[PDB]
Design a protein around this ligand. Sequence first.
Ligand SMILES: Nc1nc2c(ncn2[C@@H]2O[C@H](COP(=O)(O)OP(=O)(O)O)[C@@H](O)[C@H]2O)c(=O)[nH]1
Ligand SMILES: [Mg+2]
Length: 395
Amino acid sequence: NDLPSSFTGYFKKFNTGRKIISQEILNLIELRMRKGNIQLTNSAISDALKEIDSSVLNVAVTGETGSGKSSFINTLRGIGNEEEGAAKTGVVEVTMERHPYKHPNIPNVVFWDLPGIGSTNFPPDTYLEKMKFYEYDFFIIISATRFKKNDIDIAKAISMMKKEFYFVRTKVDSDITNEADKEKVLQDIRLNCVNTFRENGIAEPPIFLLSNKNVCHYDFPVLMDKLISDLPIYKRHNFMVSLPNITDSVIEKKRQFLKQRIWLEGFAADLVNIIPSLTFLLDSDLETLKKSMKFYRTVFGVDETSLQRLARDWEIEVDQVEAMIKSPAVFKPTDEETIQERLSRYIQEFCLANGYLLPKNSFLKEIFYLKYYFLDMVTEDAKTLLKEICLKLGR
Ligand SMILES: Nc1nc2c(ncn2[C@@H]2O[C@H](COP(=O)(O)OP(=O)(O)O)[C@@H](O)[C@H]2O)c(=O)[nH]1
Ligand SMILES: [Mg+2]
């Protein structure tokens, strides 16, 4: 129940697949805290954060023309082929150049649309050299059918360089519709794929059947979860926040990663022995808080632009969508109450329901309790809209 134990003890609420930082680093930080190395302690936390924040992810998306590379890239960034930044889909024209696509709101996440190896006449290894294989964190190998020798030869060349790769079977929704009017058409699809793999001399590998048109369906959710799990721990945060907000589970998962960063950031800023009251609101902390709110809102898809997007799909005024959630009104000017009074209330509300999160008389600085409050609010808003977005589908 001492401070060092409370610091590491906080991460016990998140399982190994949801850790933003390794147990070895946490133990090392706790050791330094217990040894009294205040310098080394803040240095280790600060370095951990810098490594988390600066992590850049480069995903290589390959597969033959028509597989769904461009669509996959759009789907992962949560954008339509129409939106700006989209990787145009249905492009048949041959190309020999890789094309980068950054997540619209997370610059540190970059997807590379690589031309199918078949489109080029490059042998597996030359293809990888030409595509600069060394720049990628992992490869997504897409097939809309049952995979072919080219896909496996690329994977074999990738494993030989000890890089991660995932076999993704797209268009399952097509096979389902074409074989109907759901059913285990998936079972057969997966079966044909395994035969192709066994056929190419390898043990049955993991296969993700999915539809770029329905991110909430099939193996898309487990794939996104597996990508995060397999990623070196420090890279998880940045990629996790860029992922599609498909279910309450994924939303909660984003919240868990964000809560851990607030905690690290809070300890890095130094704890205090004064209760959080926000008697005064510095303009600097106010600007920081406004930036945190905008970031959280963007991450969970409840930012201005996103709410505007929903204002389209739903033939209603943006004002009405905003009325459905809470985060949009936090910084909306009002003559009836100052921002300081509002944030002071939030802190009191937060600490009453959550406590101070630390041993008696130890507290995080006020701005962090506000970040936690903002995070819960936005995550709630996200679940609210998602509830409507999905159920309103009907298909
Ligand atoms: N039904 C369905 N169509 C898909 C899927 N993925 C891609 N497509 C479509 O199939 C075509 C080829 O996709 P595209 O993403 O441009 O793949 P690329 O040529 O490999 O980069 C386009 O008409 C897409 O809209 C999917 O999962 N389901
Ligand atoms: Mg394409």
